[PDB]
Design a protein around this ligand. Sequence first.
Ligand SMILES: C[C@@H](c1cccc2c(-c3ccc(CS(C)(=O)=O)c(F)c3)c(C(=O)O)[nH]c12)n1cc(CNS(=O)(=O)CCN)nn1
Ligand SMILES: [Zn+2]
Ligand SMILES: [Zn+2]
Length: 232
Amino acid sequence: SGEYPTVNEIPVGEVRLYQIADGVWSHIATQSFDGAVYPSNGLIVRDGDELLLIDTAWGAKNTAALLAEIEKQIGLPVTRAVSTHFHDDRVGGVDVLRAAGVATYASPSTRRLAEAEGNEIPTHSLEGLSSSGDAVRFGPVELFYPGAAHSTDNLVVYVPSANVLYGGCAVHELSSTSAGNVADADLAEWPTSVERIQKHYPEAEVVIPGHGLPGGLDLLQHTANVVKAHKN
Ligand SMILES: C[C@@H](c1cccc2c(-c3ccc(CS(C)(=O)=O)c(F)c3)c(C(=O)O)[nH]c12)n1cc(CNS(=O)(=O)CCN)nn1
Ligand SMILES: [Zn+2]
Ligand SMILES: [Zn+2]
């Protein structure tokens, strides 16, 4: 009823939306993985009379529920989606999106890694993001490649109209005391990549992690702190 939703308000298979700013929402869903349940976030950004989606809802059925929740709560069509890295919490549901008429995008690096892993594969390649510090415009957002962090391909997303920074899984929530799922991470490079984010988006007012509660710019330093402690 107004607070940012958590697993306890989200059974696996339901999706909730949360208004971040004018024309900016996060989507929250839950999924089971290796016998434990986790929340995950994505983003929705108004693009005139259309919507841009950032990341799936972690699974085909969750992503179908996401589209249904968007129709219920917003009522504008999702025309494009960007996946910010290759794991299932970002691309699982791309097939559902593609069958719903959504054009799906990711960097070539994400597409290659998704294909190699057996995950669903966005249709279109996002060029211009292969070097750390690269940025490109995509509808109402800027996509930024900070360097290797949670994964080698992770992208972050900035909504300049609202100073909203969606860090994806390269950014952790303030309550975290570990670095999450680090199987594909570069713990040595991650702090440098976070520093690049901090330098590029110093005016960010809301920072949204890939999992957990949004906050302010402090999430960036906190992430560097937990990653460094994990590496150690
Ligand atoms: C789907 C995704 C994934 C699944 C389950 C959990 C996560 C997590 C995660 C996020 C937060 C916490 C709480 S916290 C900051 O306090 O720790 C946490 F405890 C874990 C992440 C992530 O951090 O963003 N991602 C999660 N995933 C898959 C792979 C590679 N697959 S693999 O089977 O593991 C190795 C085989 N190659 N990596 N990530
Ligand atoms: Zn991941
Ligand atoms: Zn993640």
